Amino acid sequence: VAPTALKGSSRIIGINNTFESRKIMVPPHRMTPLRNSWTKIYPPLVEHLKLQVRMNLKTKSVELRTNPKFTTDPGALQKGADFIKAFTLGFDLDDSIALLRLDDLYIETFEVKDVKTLTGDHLSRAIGRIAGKDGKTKFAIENATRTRIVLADSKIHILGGFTHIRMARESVVSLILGSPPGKVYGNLRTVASRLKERY
Amino acid sequence: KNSKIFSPFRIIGNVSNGVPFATGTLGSTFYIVTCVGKTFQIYDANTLHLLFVSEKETPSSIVALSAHFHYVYAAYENKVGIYKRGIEEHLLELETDANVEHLCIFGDYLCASTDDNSIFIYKKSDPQDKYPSEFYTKLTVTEIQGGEIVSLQHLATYLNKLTVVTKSNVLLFNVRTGKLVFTSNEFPDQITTAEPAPVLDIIALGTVTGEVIMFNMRKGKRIRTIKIPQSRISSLSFRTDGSSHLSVGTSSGDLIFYDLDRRSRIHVLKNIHRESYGGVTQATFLNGQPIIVTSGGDNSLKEYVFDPSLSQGSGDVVVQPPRYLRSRGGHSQPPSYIAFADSQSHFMLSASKDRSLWSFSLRKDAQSQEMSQRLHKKQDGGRVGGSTIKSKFPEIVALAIENARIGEWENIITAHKDEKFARTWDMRNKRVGRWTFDTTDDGFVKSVAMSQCGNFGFIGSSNGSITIYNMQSGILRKKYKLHKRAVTGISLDGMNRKMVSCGLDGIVGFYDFNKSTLLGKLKLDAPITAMVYHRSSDLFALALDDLSIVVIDAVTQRVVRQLWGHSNRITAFDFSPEGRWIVSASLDSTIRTWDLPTGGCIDGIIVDNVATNVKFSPNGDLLATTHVTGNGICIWTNRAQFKTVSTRTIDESEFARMALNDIDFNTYTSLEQIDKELLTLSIGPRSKMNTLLHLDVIRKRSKPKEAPKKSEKLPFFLQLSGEKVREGIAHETPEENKFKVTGRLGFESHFTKQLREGSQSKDYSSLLATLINFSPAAVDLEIRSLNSFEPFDEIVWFIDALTQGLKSNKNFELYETFMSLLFKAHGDVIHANNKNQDIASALQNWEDVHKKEDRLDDLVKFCMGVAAFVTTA
Amino acid sequence: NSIAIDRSGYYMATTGADRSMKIWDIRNFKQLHSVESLPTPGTNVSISDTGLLALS
Amino acid sequence: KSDFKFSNLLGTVYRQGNITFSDDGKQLLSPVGNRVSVFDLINNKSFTFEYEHRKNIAAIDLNKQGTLLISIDEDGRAILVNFKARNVLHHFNFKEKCSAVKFSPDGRLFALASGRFLQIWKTPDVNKDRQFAPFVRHRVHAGHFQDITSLTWSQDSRFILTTSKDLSAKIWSVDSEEKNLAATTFNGHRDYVMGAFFSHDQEKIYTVSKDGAVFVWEFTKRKYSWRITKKHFFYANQAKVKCVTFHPATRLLAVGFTSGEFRLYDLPDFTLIQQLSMGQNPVNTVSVNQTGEWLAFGSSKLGQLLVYEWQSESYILKQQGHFDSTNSLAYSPDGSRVVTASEDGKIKVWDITSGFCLATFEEHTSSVTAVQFAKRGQVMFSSSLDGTVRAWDLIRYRNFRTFTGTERIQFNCLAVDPSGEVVCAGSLDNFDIHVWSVQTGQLLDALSGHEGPVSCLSFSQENSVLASASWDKTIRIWSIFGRSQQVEPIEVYSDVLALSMRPDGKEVAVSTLKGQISIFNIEDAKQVGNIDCRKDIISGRFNQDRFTAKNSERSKFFTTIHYSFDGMAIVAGGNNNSICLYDVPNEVLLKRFIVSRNMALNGTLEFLNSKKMTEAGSLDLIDDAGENSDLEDRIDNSLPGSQRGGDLSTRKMRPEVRVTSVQFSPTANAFAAASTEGLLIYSTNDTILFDPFDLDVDVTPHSTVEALREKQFLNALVMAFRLNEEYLINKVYEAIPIKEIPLVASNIPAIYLPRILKFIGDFAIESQHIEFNLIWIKALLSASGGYINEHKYLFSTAMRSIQRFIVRVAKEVVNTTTDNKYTYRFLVSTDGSM
Ligand SMILES: [Mg+2]
């Protein structure tokens, strides 16, 4: 150290992730990404969080344990479980590594039916309005609210800071209910500016 | 005794009080430590600039001073204090009541002699310790051994020996073992001074009957004997510049120099210091330079230099006499009058009983200068009649100054005791003026005043006649004759229209200077003694003979205030610059500050010595006083200038024994709301309403004209990845279930929780309270964020919240501003569902309150109906 | 900061802001001495006719 | 009446030095030449301290508690001031070129970079009373071999990093015991070191050199010691690093280059967040708010002050000031705003309270010489030496018309008719007064009759006659309006330079070259008064002069004058170091003010120091530009004979203290004087003076409170005025119940009516009791409207303030209430569907 040196809440929401042990089940579509991305997933977990990492091929789940003799941070197990789940939900690894690095990032989860009981084409057109052609509308929302959104069919996941994901939530719901696009893009301009301001 | 408005700051104009000064050398330069009563000042030998002063006044007067490199030792009563850079570092307290008299420091030993012929020795606890602190031993010289101790001196190359010099003889004490190694032979005449010579083993001894003895300690024998018949030696010093000279001071004030090699007198400097005040108290050669410093009890320090010999050969014989080089000085007796020369606190005029007027500078000591009394040549050509022997003018009883015409002609008038005319002075030239003003009624001068414009000087005679002269020519213009007794005060207002006079008859007359008419006449109960006129406020205070200060308003000619409490004469008094206080001194040894608005004494002081004069600075920062004792001026700082002062009347009885808060601090804070039904805006900046309404366009302007070009590879969450505080809405955390559009419980925002709780409690006062606290960007973000989807519960609640606020009649602009922003961001949603009962009912209630707040329109329209008409036609 | 050359044109003395003096042999370009640490940087150098090296 | 005091300095927002944010982040401290200005950004208020240095400020610093502010001028003289009380505690001379001063984050110590020594001192307690020697030395450090460019405190108040021109950064320990912790020297920079900083964990030290290199120092094995692990480089082509700041919490590095662009870097990743260009001039200083989100930038050359919200890419504050350039000023009719004209050709409107330029116009090619407002207040006119007179509309900021003479004549003075239908301008080359019709723009007529150049013009607000004065030693009164044109010349002893018209329109004052203010009666064309002014005027000896100030005849006359709106006072200014305020009826000097006390300006001193000469001459006349290290400082663009009208570089001579114009505030008892340093606004607002009116023994602060408790309001209010104390007036004002206001108002004695109207005006602008005030004003005007009408020029300033209050804040509020009322009715009444 330099001579000048100074002298279990789950971040993810909408789903219950929770010597202790934590198991995370990986769906089939994330196995191959997990395999090729496995090389970069265990080091931050084993090294920084000092957790024991196993994943069961038989049950296709990721198993984490707190090591009494090595682990030091009591929240490390839950942070580590949160980090794996983000990679499980569909977020890119670099975004998922943000959860480990920062202490104020939450994942908000909700379903289209929770907003409105839509079926058939109506549900399909609702997913379209969130995505937009070439993902422009989702692209607009993530930059403005400064979040990362994974639109897995009718399952929506929003990653970012608290107020950030509150506003990213409001844009998405207004798209589902069928608000005219002008509010969504037009108001997205204002929320982008107002958030970054000091006053 | 401790004022709540004023605190001592320093003494000005005091350079030495007669205690022998001490010389200390830092490298090449030399510094001189001088005593001023209860404090000491350090002067630089090169320029005689003031460097440092002791932080605090010692409890008792300083007796002896010795300096050694950075550290300076000052001895008062039984305590010896060590000072570095004027900061006390350590205090050596002796264990006996006997007062210390002499002080010697050689190496790591410190020697202090008490008046009971007891010598205390202190030593350094450690070899590299800076100053001696520990108590080593105690040596006492009995009457059998020798008489009283004259001084303690240490000769070079004497290992742990102290040369104690007594009236009877000289003794040699070995401090380490505390044994008397040697006692000198008895000397017939009482010894008064000792000095170690640059030669070895030889110490110069000054007797009471004009003998100087080069006594050789090693040989125990006399070497030489000077005779100075009919004299008393007070100081001695050798010249170390390579020429064998000796400077002998005498109590008569004469300094003599001898050439020891030639056995002859170089010169004598006569009356360098007054004989009355102790003459040459100290006179020391600087180590290895041709310059000799001298001091005396007359509050002066001088320096003399020996120039090189004019003869190319035999320079030793042809010795130039010493030449005055530089000096610093002050009054020899207490100042009689003071006055501020300038609007700023730079310069001070002081006149003393020593018949000299001085200009003292508060900002720097060097700038202080004496007013020369050399007279200008008469215009007529006649010879000016005066004694050929030059004698200073008599002391100055009264004085007046103006700066309207500084530099153009004379601007100061001074009156003298038992003198039938007033003399003029010029500040810019620092020299007496060319005009003399005569009373013209065979009467002495008792009052002097000047107009603000600097053109007229008023002189008040003891026989009741007021004369007016013109300053630029000194030609009499007018003469007023109302009083039949002595006039003791004159003043002219700022406008040079109304003039006021007061005399021992107790009468105050009001004259109109322009028309020369008597406006009115006022009689008081008792004789009047002095007057001060405050030009800004047109109030002037009279020190009546019944121990009362009477304030009178010149415009109306009536007594407005009368102050009582003084136990004796009022020697002097002054107004505060703002016109709100009067500080008066009296012979009961007190200074009382009177609050004119409330007419009571707010502060009181008890000074040890009566205060002859008190004068505020025109700025108001400083207050200066002069006292019956002490050659300097006491300067005080007006603590009121940095914080408020309570105006509660002082306790008279408690003061004698020593010898509604918003009224009390002369402030008032506006109520939040005068009355419930009265409209009121928010307690804050008025730009907040405008900023909220036009937030977007204001922001649009602010943006840079060209985009900032940024790196492609940038962290997405940089704002959040901030090592740690920002308080923005973006930096908010949830506080601890079915998904809800507004917020999932445990994940909702603070504002939403307040709204829902308010909706249940039917009281949104908490939500309205926090609404006002938000920043404008926060407010726009939240009103945006309201749920706009059926059943429209959030929007309906929000309208209820604002509607309740409008009933409060407080902050009604912000509520209006909020309800505008509600329409901006949710105008469409309200419009589509205007038939919905929940929205319509809330809107109707808001309108019902809002319809009431239309009286404000009527009032505003009426005033412009009349203000435009009244201002125009 | 400074350079000096003797009369013979055989030696050179250079001082730098790195608090170092270096004597050079300019006939063959070989460094002879390097007083690497000086108390403070040397502003000037000079060489006399007799060969005295002067430093300031 | 005549109790004016310096309040604030407009026209200049930054001159040189280092800008520092307040700890709370709501106030900005900017050195303006010889004084310090404080801007409260959030509340929209500002003020400039009354203390004055003797040279331009070189460094300032405010401790975190917000209680003590130290400002050090270029000579090293330091002045310690209590921020809360706005008074001077002490003055100190450090006897060197002090480069930077910084308070330790604990608040106990402050460090000085003076020459090659770092000096650490002990702060004096604010609560303690003043002493002879408040500062106590802690230590002096002497390790560097050249000047110290800048220093930085460690966050725990235990280490100071110093960066010198030695190509070296060095670290010290404030505690003697902890010296072994930090006694290292950092080397390896090719150029000067502009700044050295600590990381938040304080394990990494960043050093920046002028050439644009950033070194990251880490304590690591090659057994442990400091090393450069990473080096980042600024690839600016020729720009040099001028000012560097680091915010450890947010890892923000703001670097300002000499080319006038600045970069925000995220250390240690060296990711470029943003860079902008604020101009072609160097960025002299940069600062960071405590929270790390406002960045304040300063460029000395054009006097620009920029505050950048790098988060949102928004400008909180962007301002540019004038030095030596303000040629004129003109208050808005209501006193809201002040306009200024500069040789740059730019007309700027400044808001008095905030102190910021709210708009700028750049049409005029050459120097704008004077500006005047129409009586209405919407329209504005300005005349320039480019040969045009231009009309501006403030509602839409459009130059809705432009006038120009046929002969291409430069204009120096202008006047505008009260009806706003005729505009007249004068010239120093044509000897005639041109006239134009505002509506049409045609040259209505050229008025002739002057045998010398026209120096000033003015219309009579009532009679509508035109008074024109010339160097012809004459003044002419033109009755332009009416069927017959008439001219009535009145002769004068000497050249006439300025002119002021009585608001009644019955008399005119004229300042002559002899140093006289002569007042004439228009209808009778005979003199009514005279005031001598030569003796009052203070003029200094310039350094280049070869003759004394006393014998000098350079400026013993007043080049500008103006009446007080009450009509009883004249404020005068000239090419001199004094602003004099005379009283007309008694022809006496009410007070004299010193414009400046700076020795950077040429004309400040009457007597100059003898030491400055040698056999060559004055030391200060010696040009030492070549000593400046940078090329741009050495380069001289000066033209040999220029006197005015060009940049500071052109003239080659020191600016001269001079007051071009002066005016009284229409709505407040204050006056503004344009000078070289800027618009010095002197105001009487403070009112700590006790100026009672018609007291008796029975009146007392206690008695009035008793009169209130006993519900004798009319007496209580009246006794309040006789004492004439604001806090006492304010209390009695607010305690009168609403039912009793109309009764009290009808019974206020007429003599006190002006005082209450003034008080309501000053209180109402910033007070919160709007409906309470409007109830009072409704009462007063209804009761005593007839009296106010009969004596207009006594109540004019008071009446304008009330109209200002009711048109700015009362009307703005009702305008926002009424529009909601219609926005409400539209939403409910109409039908919304589909
Ligand atoms: Mg006719």
UniProtKB/Swiss-Prot annotation, chain A:
Example GO biological process: ribosome assembly
Main location class: cytoplasm
GO cellular component terms, A-Z: 90S preribosome; cytoplasm; nucleolus; nucleus
CDD domains in the record: KH-I_PNO1_rpt1, KH-I_PNO1_rpt2
InterPro entries according to UniProt: KH-I_PNO1_first, KH_dom_type_1_sf, KH_PNO1_2nd, KRR1-like_KH1
This protein's record includes keyword tRNA processing: no
Pfam families the UniProt entry points to: KH_KRR1_1st (PF17903), KH_PNO1_2nd (PF22891)
This protein's UniProt keywords: Cytoplasm, Nucleus, Phosphoprotein, Ribosome biogenesis, RNA-binding
Source species, domain of life: Eukaryota
Location relative to the cell: Cytoplasm; Nucleus, Nucleolus
Domain KH span(s) in chain numbering: 120-172
GO molecular function, one term: rRNA primary transcript binding
Similarity comment: family membership: Belongs to the PNO1 family.
Function noted in UniProt: Required for small ribosomal subunit (SSU) synthesis. Has a role in the processing of early nucleolar and late cytoplasmic pre-RNA species. Recruits DIM1 to nucleolar pre-RNAs. Indirectly required for cleavage at the A2 site of the 20S pre-rRNA, forming 18S rRNA, and at A1 and A2 sites of other pre-rRNAs.
Quaternary structure annotation from Swiss-Prot or TrEMBL: Component of the small ribosomal subunit, ribosomal RNA processing complex (SSU RRP complex). Interacts with NOB1.
Name under which the protein is recorded: Pre-rRNA-processing protein PNO1
Provenance organism: Saccharomyces cerevisiae (strain ATCC 204508 / S288c) (Baker's yeast)
Swiss-Prot record, chain B:
Annotated compartments: Nucleus, Nucleolus
Keyword annotations from UniProtKB, A to Z: Acetylation, Nucleus, Phosphoprotein, Repeat, Ribonucleoprotein, Ribosome biogenesis, rRNA processing, WD repeat
WD repeats: 22-53, 63-93, 101-140, 150-183, 190-227, 234-269, 277-329, 336-370, 397-436, 445-479, 487-523, 528-563, 565-606, 608-646
SUPFAM superfamilies: Quinoprotein alcohol dehydrogenase-like, WD40 repeat-like
Disulfide links within the chain: none
Biological processes, Gene Ontology terms: maturation of SSU-rRNA; rRNA processing
SMART domains noted in UniProt: WD40
Entries under InterPro entries matching the protein: Quinoprotein_ADH-like_sf, SSU_processome_Utp21, WD40/YVTN_repeat-like_dom_sf, WD40_repeat_CS, WD40_repeat_dom_sf, WD40_rpt
PROSITE patterns with a match to the protein in the record: WD_REPEATS_1 (PS00678), WD_REPEATS_2 (PS50082), WD_REPEATS_REGION (PS50294)
Keyword Nucleus: yes
Recorded GO CC terms: 90S preribosome; nucleolus; nucleoplasm; nucleus; Pwp2p-containing subcomplex of 90S preribosome; small-subunit processome
Additional observations: Present with 2020 molecules/cell in log phase SD medium.
Function according to Swiss-Prot or TrEMBL: Involved in nucleolar processing of pre-18S ribosomal RNA and ribosome assembly.
Subunit structure as annotated in this protein's UniProt entry: Interacts with snoRNA U3. Interacts with MPP10. Interacts (via WD repeats) with UTP18. Component of the ribosomal small subunit (SSU) processome composed of at least 40 protein subunits and snoRNA U3.
Domain remarks: The WD repeats are grouped into two tandem seven-bladed beta-propeller regions.
Name of the protein in question: U3 small nucleolar RNA-associated protein 21
Organism: Saccharomyces cerevisiae (strain ATCC 204508 / S288c) (Baker's yeast)
Gene transcribed to yield this protein: UTP21
Curated annotation (Swiss-Prot), chain C:
SS bond list: none
Domain of life: Eukaryota
Positions of WD repeats: 1-34
Localization in the cell: Nucleus, Nucleolus
Additional remarks: Present with 5800 molecules/cell in log phase SD medium.
Role noted for this protein: Involved in nucleolar processing of pre-18S ribosomal RNA.
Subunit structure, interactors included: Interacts with snoRNA U3. Interacts with MPP10. Component of the ribosomal small subunit (SSU) processome composed of at least 40 protein subunits and snoRNA U3.
Record's protein name: U3 small nucleolar RNA-associated protein 7
Organism: Saccharomyces cerevisiae (strain ATCC 204508 / S288c)
Upper taxonomic lineage: Eukaryota, Fungi, Dikarya, Ascomycota, Saccharomycotina
Designated gene of the protein: UTP7
Residue window of the full protein shown: 278 to 333 of 554
UniProtKB/Swiss-Prot annotation, chain D:
Gene Ontology cellular component terms for the protein in this record: 90S preribosome; cytoplasm; nucleolus; nucleoplasm; Pwp2p-containing subcomplex of 90S preribosome; small-subunit processome
Transmembrane residue ranges: none
Subcellular location(s) per record: Nucleus, Nucleolus
CDD domains from the UniProt entry: WD40
InterPro entries: Apc4-like_WD40_dom (IPR024977), G-protein_beta_WD-40_rep (IPR020472), PWP2 (IPR027145), Quinoprotein_ADH-like_sf (IPR011047), SSU_processome_Utp12 (IPR007148), WD40/YVTN_repeat-like_dom_sf (IPR015943), WD40_repeat_CS (IPR019775), WD40_repeat_dom_sf (IPR036322)
Keywords (A to Z) from UniProt: Nucleus, Phosphoprotein, Repeat, Ribonucleoprotein, Ribosome biogenesis, rRNA processing, WD repeat
Matches recorded under PROSITE patterns: WD_REPEATS_1, WD_REPEATS_2, WD_REPEATS_REGION
Quaternary structure annotation from Swiss-Prot or TrEMBL: Interacts with snoRNA U3. Interacts with MPP10. Component of the ribosomal small subunit (SSU) processome composed of at least 40 protein subunits and snoRNA U3.
The protein, known as: Periodic tryptophan protein 2
Gene of this entry: PWP2
